Every structure is written in structure tokens, then in C-alpha cells.
Design a protein around this ligand. Structure first.
Ligand SMILES: *[C@@H]1O[C@H](CO)[C@@H](O[C@@H]2O[C@H](CO)[C@@H](O[C@@H]3O[C@H](CO[C@H]4O[C@H](CO)[C@@H](O)[C@H](O[C@H]5O[C@H](CO)[C@@H](O)[C@H](O)[C@@H]5O)[C@@H]4O)[C@@H](O)[C@H](O)[C@@H]3O)[C@H](O)[C@H]2NC(C)=O)[C@H](O)[C@H]1NC(C)=O
Ligand SMILES: Cc1cc2nc3c(=O)[nH]c(=O)nc-3n(C[C@H](O)[C@H](O)[C@H](O)COP(=O)(O)OP(=O)(O)OC[C@H]3O[C@@H](n4cnc5c(N)ncnc54)[C@H](O)[C@@H]3O)c2cc1C
Ligand code: HEM
Ligand code: HEM
Ligand SMILES: *[C@@H]1O[C@H](CO)[C@@H](O)[C@H](O)[C@H]1NC(C)=O
Ligand SMILES: *[C@@H]1O[C@H](CO)[C@@H](O)[C@H](O)[C@H]1NC(C)=O
Ligand SMILES: *[C@@H]1O[C@H](CO)[C@@H](O)[C@H](O)[C@H]1NC(C)=O
Ligand SMILES: *[C@@H]1O[C@H](CO)[C@@H](O)[C@H](O)[C@H]1NC(C)=O
Lengths: 1075, 228
């Protein structure tokens, strides 16, 4: 189909070896040379009581001057090409997190980090990524995972994946996307791609000046950017040459051919040019591709390679042009160039070529324990501190990973054992060996403890130590002999024999000459060495004298300017009640335009079912809250989020479920058809259905209290989030946050007014304040339409309460689990109460009676057929709203002009009495009868009608109808007994008793009265002795007798005990009817 | 009894399209016929037709050879990677990569993986989550518009038809705020490109929302000004 007659090399690394498809891949795990050396055995790192302090170990041995020349004259381009190569292979620097630190503890009075002797100061340090399937038993301790393709496959130029190798390509020929300048890559791919760390010398952390390379952090030094740009420009050069020699080729063909050529040249240079110079001995040879060698990067390789390359970086890097005029003092200092965004010198391709030609001529530092101050003191700080000791972080990483000691990792490689400290480096102790003494004193003269960084750096005289050399050599031999796409493999079919013999004759001078267009006589044959004959000598060895000083330290303060704004936002949230209060106030002003034990016994007797219901409800809510809070505090919880926010998260997650349940079932409370059906069943004897509104208000108050607790907890949380680094936030809410090294978290107002939970929570706070203040007792008595207009927010409330949980911040949404059944039932009951309609009665006459009762009488609609003991609910619209209030009828069915007796007991009733005052014009909206109309006293020869307290309302209708039916039709001797406390509001009932006594001439109904109020009365102008009552009843006349009763719990319990104590020997049914 | 059959047809069609669209993986549909590499350990290029389908809850990626049997193997693939709150995407991608299914399918699956540069996962995990919750809300409203019409409260049964027709165009917006970012992300497949544009379910939701918004309004205005 085309000219790609080979198997294109994957970017991720998979499918490179036939048997194991996973060996060199993006997120593979490091394969140790020595069993893990953790503290407990699995994942705990050794620490300061056991091993010396990193910041005190660094200061003693690895500190000295900066003007020492290398013993083998290795130019600094070698050092930084090694830094480049060793980012193609291994990368264990990005902190994977369930956030876990192991901080560095500075000694007292450190002239750099603790200058003013402020007791103890802490340098933060975070653990790196680990393999999720390891670290759970002493059989398999925790193993880390490098995040780059573990082959030498140009995984630093083209990225380590395929979605990455696209975001830096232009698809215009085979070319990587450049910017306005053809030499430099496109800074415009900065976010979501590369590593953004603030320049520690100024503070700029913007995406401008962050190029697009294949290594996530290649901008860490201009001297590493130089090689990045070199390889970028070389790819573009060879690709455009391919285009000018094969014009009809596409974009993919050019890209893949140039890519394979660049990868081959890179592998050749790296291996057969850099290794014989890093450690001064050549790789053996190339045997056949070995499909069984394990090319897995070890941690000891990380330590050796990188933490030994760090020993020879100089203080300042030179700069020279083709004829080496070392100006472009001009030697740009290193400690001021970390993460430089735009450098005023390196702004054009000629300056980058000058930097390369200057590095290729400057003899890097010498190879020993001494490390310059530009890394030891002034290495850019990962978080919160802007500066950090390097060698005190490399030791923390060596003990973070399970690195061995120096005597344990010197016998697992076949190397001889060492006797004592003087025998670590025999040549060092021959001249000023007072550093081995200083490091023995630190380790208490215990030789088998060297953390293998100070042990390796102490053995290296002019080359890497015998320990580091073998690790690096055999690791690279395993990398080459276990790689299928190795350019010297004749089986993969990438290059022919002459294309291999041509790639294997390419040095770094050829690439520099091709890219920088420089004459080949302005450089040296071996760029990794300066050997007294090469052109353009060095002016003078670069000591740290005459260079600009390093930019001093400063601690970074999240939540620094935006504290006043945070306090003001909290104060404004708290003054939501005041705004609604003022609005409702102006609305009102505009609308106007030994005995105590018996008392407690009586109280517990009346209020048994209320106490039961309240106790059960609060038990359920407390159980939900306790379940959530206990699960979070100390239980089976993955302790990722709970580090210092235990209190806040416990509070929020505990109150959330309780308030969701309370809201769902406060919706359940207000369904009146189900209640009208239920209160005429045995359920009423266990739970009272006449206190639904009191239960409603109680639930509402409790829910607002718990909601205030919820909001306060979330405010504390939002504060504790605005001071947490990005590396911690990026694994509490993954997917919502990403860890590029900018490290600055989002401000408070982002959490409040730019997130769905925060925004809808502020909206819900406002709606709750409005709905709760407008519903107050002192604000609904004034205007029933104000109360009625706001309360329709509950649908807006139940919309917001679904959006509040619509996210995966902390947990899954559970409100829709609670909200289903109550909302279904409530909507059904609303439809039932909205289907039927009855309206527009006309009030015939309404006289006003004393004691509060207002006798009301209205005409009977034609279709109105009802029974004795049924209530209707009416609303007057003249004063207020269409609010249906229930009232029991007090007229016999045979009588026209249905009646009512209404007792003044609050806002609506007092307003209605005011409306019908001065005797009748307004018209109500009667809504039909609501009852079962139980007439079961026809089945009993003799009945006993008992009514108490408020329950004597329907007995007027009952008795009038009963005497009328007994008279007209032509139930023997039915008795009526009513016991009241004061007989205050029920005087019309006495008038009706008189009217019934006068009507009946057949002597059917006999009334009896017990007033039972002693010593506290007005004289008004005994107890109901049910015990001998039934005994005399059956005696005086031999009648089964009904004793139906309606009243308070005390009287009905008393008559129950009586009829039961006297039943045992007629029927005495005792069918307690609640009208 | 024609009008009764018409009302039943309208109600049943609206309910069926709501249900089908909420569970359909055809909101964004791309398709192309490219020349790609089949799989690892072989240098042979194939001729296939590749296309993905995004459905608020995961993607379907289909690799089908123009000759189904062109390299001694039959090429008919239809793989699904889902990102809804119930499941996880990275584990599915890892299992697919351990299996060894063809390279273009793995590539198009990788484009949507979490932490990929294109960032195509966290705007498809939330938009497809809200547009699948505003289509469970425009169902309880259709049920109420079915009930309030059965027991005639049509004066209040003509507002559920303004709520259903609005909760559909309130979910045709969350899935409309995603093509703004899927456009820059490249999808080059060998020598061909892949353009993903709105598919059937989007236009069907648009039509049904317009129909309900107009029908509720017209019936409410009629039964208000003329209860005929
Ligand atoms: C979105 O994707 C999902 C997931 O695929 C779809 O749901 C599935 O629908 C199918 C269709 O009925 C159900 O039936 C399954 O389909 C299997 C398809 O088999 C092909 O793919 C295999 C791997 O998936 C592959 O091995 C095979 O060919 C390869 O192996 C051959 C050897 O066996 C070899 O000779 C070939 O050359 C090639 O290498 C097939 O091409 C089918 O095999 C089974 O019968 C299986 O039951 C699935 O059950 C459904 N998924 C689930 C989880 O149940 C869904 O429909 C898609 N969405 C839409 C809108 O269509
Ligand atoms: C003759 C008569 C018969 C009655 N019959 C019944 C009856 O059969 N069933 C019945 O439930 N109530 C009945 N009531 C109670 C009567 O409904 C209340 O007095 C009135 O509805 C509300 O009073 P308000 O709104 O003026 O004062 P508010 O201050 O609103 O009254 C406060 C008290 O009344 C109760 N209440 C308020 N609204 C209602 C309501 N819609 N339903 C029940 N209780 C409410 C609350 O629980 C609260 O404790 C009757 C009252 C009278 C005078
Ligand atoms: C203290 C605050 C509240 C008080 C005083 C209060 C009081 C009332 C009262 C008195 C009624 C109706 C009384 C009647 O029918 O005449 C009512 C109805 C209602 N209230 Fe509240 N309520 C309060 C808080 C809430 C809250 C927080 C909700 C939230 C759900 C709420 C939901 C309702 C509901 C749903 C109705 C139904 C009214 C209907 O449609 O018939 N109430 N409230
Ligand atoms: C500062 C204001 C508030 C903030 C910041 C806030 C924040 C949150 C957050 C983060 C959650 C969990 C997030 C999620 O997973 O969806 C939550 C859940 C909840 N919040 Fe709030 N909230 C606030 C105010 C309120 C108020 C006033 C209420 C009262 C209704 C409330 C009721 C709830 C409820 C019921 C949940 C339940 C979560 C669930 O669905 O399971 N919140 N809130
Ligand atoms: C795809 O490959 C076939 C193989 O013969 C070739 O004829 C055709 O031109 C190619 N088309 C594209 C777009 O690559
Ligand atoms: C190199 O720098 C010197 C410094 O004066 C300058 O004279 C010369 O033109 C530059 N370019 C060369 C030598 O190509
Ligand atoms: C091939 O041999 C050596 C290896 O670097 C080199 O010096 C020589 O110039 C090369 N010959 C060429 C490039 O013609
Ligand atoms: C290393 O460079 C210095 C710089 O002048 C030179 O004197 C010395 O001879 C060089 N080393 C060797 C082995 O030539």
C-alpha cells in the first residue's frame, strides 16, 4: 500500500517482546537487584533514629569548593547529554499519592534554611508512584513504577505515548510543530502536556516559555533545553531532507522514516559514544538479539546514574560562537536558571548554538563527594519552600524506594567485601581522609549502613566507583541485548547492512555540524572529551567567583491576599437571614398600607404516642448520622481524604444523610388524603394523625439546625482546601485536578461560586432562609399570601437538592434513594386532592357566640348527601388565601342549611371571625364530607355514647339526627355521657342538649354530665363513675350494648379498663370511634 | 375515535423516543475508510472502515475490513469502553491492551483515557452524566402529562408538556458543550482523518423537544381561551 515495509515501533512500549508484552512499557514496575529494605518489611522507610539526618549528612561530606577540574577532562556537554539520556529510560520523580510525605528535618541554625535560629523548620518531601498490586505482605513489598518507556527508543523526543506524540506534531510533512520561530518548538502546547514549575528566582509560573518536548520536564535547565532543541531540529532537518529527496511521500511516511533514522542515531550515539566515556570502558560486542534477557530498570540504576551525574555539574556554563569569543560575566549562572521561562540571551537559534558550542568546550567538575552549592543549597523546591537541598532529597528518595545499603548491595554483585571505613576509598584516606572520619562519626562507626549514595560517592576517585560502574554497564547491556527494534538487529528489517554501517559511524560532532551549520573544524572529534589539542581552549576553570549570586529563599503563602475576601464571603453567607427579614418587614409594612407527680402522670398519659413517634424519628436520624460519622472517623475507610480534615468531613458526611432523610419525610408529612384515610383505622391508637403540622414544624427546625452544621463543616473544608498543595488536591478529587508542578490551589471563591455543589449550596441557603423566615409564626399571621407565595420554593429546593449531589467529589448521590417513595406518595395524594372539586357555598346566617365559637350556617348544595359525623373543609378568599381548614359539621342530615361551630384558635380562625363579624356576605369553598360515617349503634339494643374534651363536636349532629330518626320512623334507650374540664367553649352544646331533651317525648336519649374540675373554677354559674355504671345498666333493663367513646387518651383508657373489668362473667363491644 | 388514536400514538412515541435516546450510543457519530496497520508482530497494512459512536455512557469503536477476510482473518470488531460513574475507563483500556485487539481501536480508545493530553474524558464523563439525568427528569414529567390527561385536568396537563419539552432541550445543551473541545483534538488514522459530528439521537431529541414545547403551548392556549 505504501513504502512503510516494516513494523512501526509503538510509542507506549508494549508488544516489543513476543512472550512478555509488558516488559518495557509506560507504567511498568522497577525490578530490584536486591530484596526490599523497608523498615517494617513492606512499605515503611528507614528514618532519622535509625539513619543520620539527610540535611546533616549532606553538609558534612558533600560540601566544598566549585573550582575543581575533572580528572579525565570530560566536557559538560557529556554531563548534560547524560542527563538527557537518563530521562529516556527512567523517571521516578512524580509523586503518585494517597498523599503521603516523609519530610526533611533541618538542624538548628542552618545558615541557609534556618538562618534566624527559629527552632526547627521542616522541608516537605513526598513519596513517588508505586505499583497498586504490590505492598501488602512481606512476600512482595512495595515496588515503584517509572512513567517513561523503559527502552532507549527516543521516548524523550517523541513522547512516551500516542496521544502525546500527536500534540507535538504538525502533520505538514513529517515535522514536529514549531512556533513562530522555526528553530524552537511550540510553547502553545504547554498546559496538559508539560511540567510547569515556577521559576524559583522570580516567581513566574505562566505557560509562556514552556516548550513542548517528549520528556515531561526538559525545561528544568537551559542546558537541557539546548539538547532538546538539538534533537528537535535534527528530526526536522532529516525529515525535510527526506521530503526534498522523495517528494511524492505523505506526512506519515516522512515522519516514520525520519523517526526511525533519528532513533537509530540516538541509540548509536548514546551507547557507543557516551558509555565508553561515562565509565571509561567499552561495551563488549553485539551478539544476537536475546529474546530472554530482562530489560527492566532497577532503582539502583536510578541512584548510580543520576545521583552520580549530579557530582560534576559546574557552577556556571560558558558560551561561545564559532570562533570562540567567550561572551555570547557571560557565563550564565546555574542556580538562577532553573525553569527559566524566557531567557534574555537564549532567544534565538544562534544563541542556542553558542550555548552548545560553549558546553562542548567547558571541562565539567571533578568526580568525587564534593557537590557544588547550586544544587546542594539552591535546588528548586518541589512545594511550599521555593528552595531545597538536592543531596538531602536524593537520600530521602533512596530511603523512600527500598534501596539497599552499601555493604548489602556490594555482595549481591560479586564484588569483594570491605573491612572498615578507611578501606572504602584507600586513595582518599592517603590525603586528607578527614571526611571518612566525619561520615563514620555520623554512622556511629557502623560500616554496614551506608545509604549507597554516600557510599558510592565516597569510592569514586576519577571515574564512577566499582559499584556504580557494574550497575550502569550491565543495565545498559540488558537494555541493548533485550531490545527488538535495536538498530543493529538484522531481523527486525529496519535498516540494511550499509544503513547500519552508516549509522554506526555517527558522532555527536556530526549532528552539531548538521544542525548548527558550523564548520567541522570548529569542534573536536570526541565532544565528550577535551584533550589538549582540540580547538578553542577554555579561558580559565570556572570557580564560583565573579558570578551573580543565587536568588535568596522565600516561603510560598497560599491564602495570603484572599483572607479578607474569605471572611467577607462568610459574613455575607451568615447575613442571609437579615436580608430576608428586612424584605419581609417591608412586605408587612407595605401590606398594612406530690401534685407535680400527678401532673407528670397525666402528661405522660395524654402524650404517649407523640413521645413514641418523636423518639422513633430521632432514633432513625441519629442512627444514620452515627453510621456515616463512624464509618468515616475510625472504620473501613481508605485514609486518602482524612489527614487533617477528619472533623470537617465527618461533620458534613454525617449531616448530609440526616438532612436528606428529614427533607424527604417532611415532604411525606403533608399528604392529607392518606391521613384522612388512616386516622379512621387502628393506626391512630398508636400514632396521632392530628399533630401532623406540629411534627412538620419540628422536623423543619431540626433540619435547619443540621443544615447549618453541614454548611459550617463545608466552610471549614473549603478553607482547608485553599491551603493544600496541588499535589495533595490532585488525588483527593482526581479528574477534577491535575498535577502540573504549578502547585497553587484554586481560591476559595472558585470552590464557592464556580463549582456545582458550592453554587447550589449558596442558592439553597438563600432559598431556605427565605422560606423559613416568611413562614415564621409572626410573619404568617400578618399575610397568608406572603406565606403562600414563598412556600412554593420547595420544588426549587428539591431541584437544587438533586444538583447538589450531581458530582463524584466525595461519594455517590444517595438523595434520589430517599426521595422516591415520599415524593411518589405525595404526588399521588396531590392528584387525588386536585381531581375532585366543590366550591361556592352561600352563608345563610352566621351569628357570633361568646367564648370564641362563631356559629356559621350556609345553604346546602343540591348534590350534598352526607351522614352524621362527617367533617368538611372550607376556605374564605376574602381575607388571605385558599387555605382549606377542616371543621366537623354540627347539623343533622335531614336539616337543610348545613351548620358549623368554629372556635377561635389562631390566625385563620380570628381572621374568619373578623370577616363574618357584625351580623354573612362572603362565600366559602366547602370541599365535601370526609369520613366513614360509622353508624354502628344500630346493631346494639342499648348504646352508651361517651364524648370528652374536644371530641364532643360531632355528638350534636349525632344526637339530633338520632332523635329525629327515632321520632319520624316510629337502639333502645341510648345514653349520652360527656365529661369536660371547664365547659367553656361548649355552651352551644348545652343549648343543643336542651333542644334535644325538649324535642324527644318518647324518653329515648338520657344525658349525663360530669364537670370534673375542683377548687379552680368560676363556680361555672365529680368523676365519670363507669365502674358501677355497667353493673347497674344490665340490671335495670335486660338488653350486647355498645359503649362507643371519643375523647382524650385518659378518659378512653379509663372507660376501656372499666368495660373490660366488667365484661368478664353481655358483649360491651367498646368500639372507640375517632371522628 | 381518530383523535384518541392520535393522542395515544403521540404519547407512546414521545415516551419511546425518550427511553431509546437515553440508552442510545449514537449522539456523536464519526466514520472514515482508512488504510491502517492491523496488529502487532506483522508489517501488513489493511484496508478498513473505522468509526466511533459516543453515547453519554461510553464509546463504541468499530473496525471492519472492506473485505471482511483479507489477511486470512475475519475483521469485524465492536468494542465498548464506558466511563459512567458505575464503571471505570482505565481498567477497561488496560484489559483491552492486554488482550491484543487491533491498533486503531486501541488508539481511538486511548484518545478518551483519563489524563490523556486531549482531555476528552472529564468533559464527557460529566456532560454525558447530566444529559442522562435531565432525560430521567423528562420522563417523570411525561408520565405526569400522561396521567393528568387521563383524568382530565388538561389545564394543568398542558404544563407537563412544557416541562418535558424543556428538560430535553436542557440536556441537548450539556452534550452541546462538548464538540467545542472535541474539535481541536486530532484523530489522524494513518492517512485519513476522523470528523465526529452530531448523530441521530441529537436531532431526534431536538425534534421531540420542539414538538412537546409547541404541543403543550398550543393545547394550553386553546383549552384556556376556548375549552371546546
Ligand atoms: C458497543 O460495544 C458492545 C461491546 O462489544 C456491544 O455489545 C456486544 O454486542 C455483541 C453483538 O451481539 C454481543 O455479542 C458478542 O460479540 C462478539 C464479537 O466477536 C468479535 O469480537 C471478538 C472480540 O470482541 C473477536 O474475538 C472476534 O474476531 C476475532 O477473533 C476470531 C476468533 O474467535 C478471529 O477468527 C478473528 O479474525 C478476530 O481475530 C469477533 O470479530 C461475538 O464473538 C460473541 O458472540 C459475543 O457474544 C456482546 O455480548 C455484546 N457485549 C456484551 C458485553 O455483552 C454493543 O452492541 C455496541 N453498541 C452498539 C450500539 O452496537
Ligand atoms: C368545630 C371544630 C371541628 C374541627 N374538626 C377537625 C377535624 O375533624 N379534623 C381536624 O384535623 N381538625 C379539626 N379542627 C381543628 C381546626 O381545623 C383548627 O382550629 C383550624 O383548622 C386551624 O386553626 P388556625 O389555622 O386558625 O390556627 P393555627 O395556629 O394554624 O392552629 C394551630 C394548631 O392547629 C392544627 N392545625 C392547623 N391546620 C390544620 C389542618 N389543616 N388540619 C388539622 N390540624 C391543623 C395544628 O396541628 C396546630 O397545633 C376542628 C376545629 C373546630 C373548631
Ligand atoms: C418552620 C418552617 C415551616 C413551617 C412553619 C411550615 C409550616 C407549614 C405549614 C403550616 C404548611 C401548610 C399548612 C396548611 O396546610 O394550612 C406547610 C405546608 C408545607 N410545607 Fe411547610 N413549613 C415549614 C418548613 C417547611 C419546609 C422546610 C418544607 C420543605 C419541604 C416545607 C414543606 C411544606 C410543604 C411541602 C407543604 C405542603 C403544602 C401543600 O402543598 O399543601 N415546609 N408548611
Ligand atoms: C455552603 C453550602 C453548601 C455546600 C458548600 C455544600 C456542599 C455539599 C457537598 C460538597 C455535598 C456533597 C457533594 C456531592 O457529592 O454532591 C453536599 C451534599 C449535600 N448537601 Fe450541601 N452544601 C451546602 C449547603 C447545603 C445546604 C444548605 C443544604 C440543605 C439542603 C445542603 C444539603 C446537602 C445535601 C442534602 C447533601 C446530600 C448529598 C447527597 O446527595 O447525598 N447542602 N453539600
Ligand atoms: C488504501 O490502500 C489501497 C491498497 O491498494 C490503495 O489502492 C488505496 O489508494 C489506499 N487509499 C488510501 C486513502 O490510503
Ligand atoms: C563571533 O564573535 C566575535 C566576537 O567579537 C565576532 O567578532 C564574530 O563576528 C562572531 N562570529 C564568527 C566568528 O563567526
Ligand atoms: C568512519 O570511521 C570513523 C568512525 O567515526 C570516522 O572517523 C570516519 O570519518 C568515518 N568515515 C566516513 C564518515 O567517511
Ligand atoms: C585537560 O585540559 C587542560 C586545560 O588546559 C589541559 O591543560 C590538559 O592537558 C588536559 N588533559 C589532558 C590529558 O590533555
Amino acid at each position: 500500500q505504501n513504502s512503510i515495509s516494516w513494523e512501526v515501533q509503538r510509542f507506549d512500549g508494549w508488544y516489543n517482546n513476543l512472550m512478555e508484552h509488558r516488559w518495557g512499557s509506560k507504567g511498568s514496575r522497577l525490578q530490584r537487584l536486591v530484596p526490599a529494605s523497608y523498615a517494617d518489611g513492606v512499605y515503611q522507610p528507614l528514618k532519622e533514629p535509625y539513619l543520620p539526618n539527610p540535611r546533616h549528612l549532606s553538609n558534612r561530606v558533600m560540601r566544598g569548593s566549585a573550582g575543581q577540574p575533572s580528572l579525565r577532562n570530560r566536557t559538560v556537554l557529556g554531563v548534560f547529554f547524560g542527563y538527557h539520556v537518563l530521562s529516556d529510560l527512567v523517571s521516578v520523580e512524580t509523586p503518585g499519592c494517597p498523599a503521603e510525605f516523609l519530610n526533611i528535618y533541618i538542624p538548628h541554625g542552618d545558615p541557609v534554611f534556618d538562618p534566624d535560629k527559629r527552632g526547627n523548620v521542616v522541608l516537605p518531601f513526598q513519596r513517588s508512584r508505586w505499583d497498586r498490586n504490590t505492598g501488602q505482605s512481606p512476600s512482595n513489598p512495595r515496588d515503584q513504577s517509572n512513567q517513561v518507556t523503559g527502552w532507549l527508543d527516543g521516548s524523550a523526543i517523541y513522547g512516551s505515548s500516542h496521544s502525546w506524540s500527536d500534540t507535538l506534531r504538525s502533520f505538514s510533512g513529517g515535522q514536529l510543530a514549531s512556533g513562530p520561530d522555526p528553530a524552537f518548538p511550540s510553547d502553545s502546547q504547554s498546559s496538559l502536556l508539560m511540567w510547569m514549575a515556577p521559576d524559583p528566582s522570580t516567581g513566574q509560573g505562566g505557560p509562556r516559555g514552556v516548550y513542548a518536548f517528549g520528556a515531561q520536564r526538559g525545561n528544568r535547565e537551559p542546558f537541557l533545553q539546548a539538547l532538546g532543541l538539538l534533537w528537535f531540529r535534527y528530526h526536522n532537518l532529516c525529515a525535510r531532507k527526506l521530503a526534498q529527496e522523495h517528494p511524492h511521500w505523505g506526512d506519515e511516511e516522512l515522519f516514520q522514516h525520519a523517526r526511525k533514522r533519528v532513533i537509530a542515531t540516538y541509540q548509536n550515539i548514546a551507547m557507543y559514544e557516551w558509555l565508553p566515556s561515562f565509565l571509561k570502558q567499552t561495551p563488549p560486542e553485539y551478539p544476537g538479539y536475546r529474546p530472554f534477557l530482562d530489560p527492566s530498570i532497577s532503582p539502583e540504576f536510578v541512584v548510580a546514574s543520576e545521583q552520580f551525574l549530579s557530582t560534576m555539574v559546574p557552577s556556571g556554563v560558558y558560551m561561545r560562537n564559532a570562533s570562540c569569543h567567550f561572551q555570547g560575566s557571560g557565563a550564565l549562572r546555574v542556580c538562577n536558571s532553573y525553569w527559566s521561562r524566557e531567557h534574555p540571551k537564549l532567544q534565538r537559534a544562534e544563541d542556542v548554538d553558542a550555548l552548545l558550542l560553549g558546553m562542548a568546550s567547558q571541562i565539567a567538575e571533578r568526580e568525587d563527594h564534593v557537590v557544588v552549592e547550586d544544587m546542594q543549597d539552591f535546588w528548586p523546591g518541589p512545594l511550599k519552600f521555593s528552595r531545597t537541598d538536592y543531596l538531602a532529597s536524593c537520600l530521602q528518595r533512596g530511603r523512600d524506594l527500598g534501596l539497599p545499603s552499601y555493604t548489602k548491595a556490594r555482595e549481591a554483585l560479586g564484588l569483594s567485601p570491605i573491612s572498615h571505613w578507611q578501606d572504602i576509598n584507600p586513595a582518599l584516606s592517603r590525603s586528607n581522609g578527614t571526611v571518612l572520619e566525619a561520615t563514620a562519626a555520623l554512622y556511629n562507626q557502623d560500616l554496614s549502613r551506608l545509604e549507597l549514595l554516600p557510599g558510592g560517592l565516597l569510592e569514586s576517585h576519577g571515574d564512577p566507583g566499582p559499584l556504580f560502574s557494574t550497575i550502569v554497564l550491565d543495565q545498559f547491556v540488558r537494555l541493548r541485548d533485550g531490545d527488538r527494534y535495536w538498530f543493529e538487529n538484522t531481523r527486525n528489517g529496519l535498516f540494511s547492512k550499509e544503513e547500519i554501517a552508516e549509522i554506526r559511524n555517527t558522532s555527536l560532532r556530526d549532528i552539531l555540524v548538521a544542525v548548527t551549520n558550523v564548520d567541522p573544524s570548529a569542534l573536536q572529534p570526541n565532544v565528550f572529551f577535551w584533550l589538549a589539542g582540540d580547538p578553542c581552549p577554555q579561558p580559565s576553570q570556572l570557580s564560583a567567583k565573579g558570578l551573580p549570586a543565587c536568588a535568596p529563599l522565600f516561603i510560598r503563602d497560599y491564602f495570603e491576599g484572599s483572607g479578607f475576601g474569605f471572611g467577607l464571603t462568610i459574613g455575607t453567607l451568615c447575613c442571609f437571614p437579615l436580608v430576608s427579614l428586612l424584605s419581609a418587614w417591608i412586605v408587612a409594612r407595605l401590606r398594612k398600607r406530690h401534685q407535680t407527680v400527678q401532673q407528670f402522670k397525666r402528661f405522660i398519659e395524654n402524650y404517649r404516642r407523640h413521645i413514641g413517634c418523636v423518639a422513633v424519628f430521632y432514633t432513625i436520624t441519629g442512627a444514620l448520622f452515627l453510621e456515616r460519622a463512624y464509618y468515616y472517623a475510625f472504620a473501613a475507610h481508605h485514609s486518602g481524604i482524612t489527614d487533617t480534615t477528619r472533623v470537617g468531613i465527618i461533620l458534613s458526611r454525617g449531616t448530609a444523610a440526616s438532612i436528606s432523610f428529614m427533607f424527604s419525610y417532611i415532604l411525606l408529612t403533608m399528604c392529607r388524603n392518606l391521613i384522612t384515610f388512616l386516622r379512621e383505622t387502628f393506626l391512630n391508637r398508636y400514632i396521632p394523625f392530628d399533630a401532623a403540622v406540629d411534627f412538620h414544624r419540628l422536623i423543619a427546625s431540626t433540619a435547619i439546625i443540621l443544615t447549618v452544621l453541614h454548611s459550617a463543616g463545608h466552610v471549614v473544608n473549603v478553607y482547608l482546601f485553599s491551603i493544600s498543595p496541588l499535589s495533595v488536591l490532585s488525588c483527593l478529587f482526581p479528574g477534577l485536578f491535575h498535577d502540573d508542578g504549578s502547585e497553587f490551589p484554586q481560591k476559595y471563591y472558585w470552590w464557592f461560586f464556580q463549582t456545582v455543589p458550592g453554587l447550589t449550596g449558596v442558592l439553597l441557603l438563600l432559598a431556605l432562609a427565605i422560606m423559613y423566615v416568611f413562614a415564621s409564626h409572626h410573619f404568617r399571621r400578618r399575610s397568608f399570601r406572603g406565606f403562600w407565595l414563598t412556600h412554593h420554593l420547595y420544588i426549587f429546593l428539591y431541584i437544587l437538592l438533586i444538583i447538589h449531589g450531581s458530582f463524584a467529589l466525595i461519594q455517590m448521590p444517595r438523595f434520589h434513594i430517599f426521595f422516591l417513595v415520599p415524593a411518589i406518595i405525595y404526588v399521588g395524594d396531590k392528584l387525588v386532592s386536585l381531581s375532585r372539586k366543590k366550591v361556592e357555598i352561600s352563608v345563610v346566617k352566621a351569628e357570633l357566640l361568646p367564648s370564641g365559637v362563631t356559629h356559621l350556617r350556609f345553604q346546602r348544595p343540591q348534590g350534598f348527601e352526607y351522614k352524621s359525623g362527617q367533617w368538611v373543609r372550607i376556605a374564605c378568599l376574602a381575607l388571605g388565601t385558599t387555605e382549606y381548614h377542616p371543621f366537623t359539621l354540627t347539623s343533622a342530615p335531614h336539616e337543610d342549611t348545613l351548620s358549623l361551630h368554629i372556635r377561635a384558635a389562631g390566625p385563620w380562625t380570628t381572621r374568619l371571625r373578623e370577616i363574618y363579624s357584625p351580623p354573612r356576605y362572603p362565600k366559602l369553598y366547602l370541599d365535601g364530607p370526609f369520613g366513614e360515617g360509622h353508624q354502628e349503634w344500630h346493631k346494639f339494643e342499648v348504646s352508651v355514647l361517651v364524648g370528652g374534651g374536644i371530641g364532643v363536636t360531632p355528638f350534636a349532629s349525632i344526637l339530633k339526627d338520632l332523635v329525629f330518626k327515632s321520632s319520624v320512623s316510629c337502639c333502645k334507650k341510648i345514653y349520652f355521657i360527656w365529661v369536660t374540664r371547664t365547659q367553656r367553649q361548649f355552651e352551644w352544646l348545652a343549648d343543643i342538649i336542651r333542644e334535644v331533651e325538649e324535642n324527644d317525648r318518647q324518653d329515648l336519649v338520657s344525658v349525663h354530665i360530669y364537670i370534673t374540675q375542683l377548687a379552680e373554677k368560676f363556680d361555672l354559674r365529680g368523676r365519670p363513675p363507669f365502674e358501677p355504671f355497667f353493673n347497674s345498666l344490665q340490671e335495670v333493663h335486660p338488653q350486647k350494648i355498645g359503649v362507643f367513646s371519643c375523647g382524650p387518651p385518659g378518659m378512653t383508657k379509663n372507660v376501656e379498663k372499666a368495660c373490660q373489668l366488667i365484661n368478664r362473667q353481655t358483649h360491651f363491644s367498646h368500639h372507640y370511634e375517632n371522628f | 375515535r381518530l383523535f384518541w388514536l392520535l393522542r395515544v400514538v403521540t404519547s407512546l412515541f414521545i415516551g419511546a423516543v425518550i427511553l431509546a435516546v437515553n440508552f442510545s450510543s449514537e449522539w456523536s457519530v464519526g466514520h472514515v475508510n482508512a488504510n491502517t496497520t492491523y496488529k502487532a508482530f506483522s508489517p501488513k497494512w489493511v484496508s478498513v472502515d473505522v468509526g466511533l459512536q459516543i453515547g453519554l455512557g461510553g464509546v463504541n469503536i468499530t473496525l471492519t475490513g472492506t473485505p471482511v477476510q483479507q489477511l486470512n482473518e475475519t475483521i469485524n470488531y465492536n468494542e465498548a469502553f464506558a466511563w459512567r460513574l458505575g464503571r471505570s475507563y482505565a481498567e477497561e483500556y488496560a484489559k483491552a491492551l492486554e488482550k491484543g485487539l487491533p491498533d486503531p481501536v486501541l488508539y481511538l480508545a486511548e484518545k478518551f483515557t483519563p489524563r490523556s493530553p486531549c482531555g476528552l474524558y472529564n468533559q464527557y464523563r460529566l456532560a454525558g452524566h447530566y444529559a442522562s439525568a435531565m432525560l430521567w427528569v423528562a420522563f417523570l414529567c411525561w408520565l405526569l402529562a400522561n396521567v393528568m390527561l387521563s383524568m382530565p385536568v388538561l389545564v394543568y396537563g398542558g404544563h407537563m408538556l412544557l416541562a418535558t419539552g424543556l428538560f430535553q432541550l436542557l440536556a441537548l445543551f450539556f452534550f452541546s458543550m462538548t464538540t467545542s473541545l472535541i474539535s481541536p483534538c486530532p484523530l489522524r488514522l494513518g492517512t485519513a482523518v476522523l470528523h465526529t459530528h452530531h448523530g441521530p439521537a441529537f436531532w431526534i431529541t431536538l425534534a421531540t423537544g420542539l414538538l412537546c414545547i409547541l404541543l403543550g403551548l398550543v393545547m394550553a392556549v386553546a383549552h384556556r381561551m376556548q375549552p371546546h
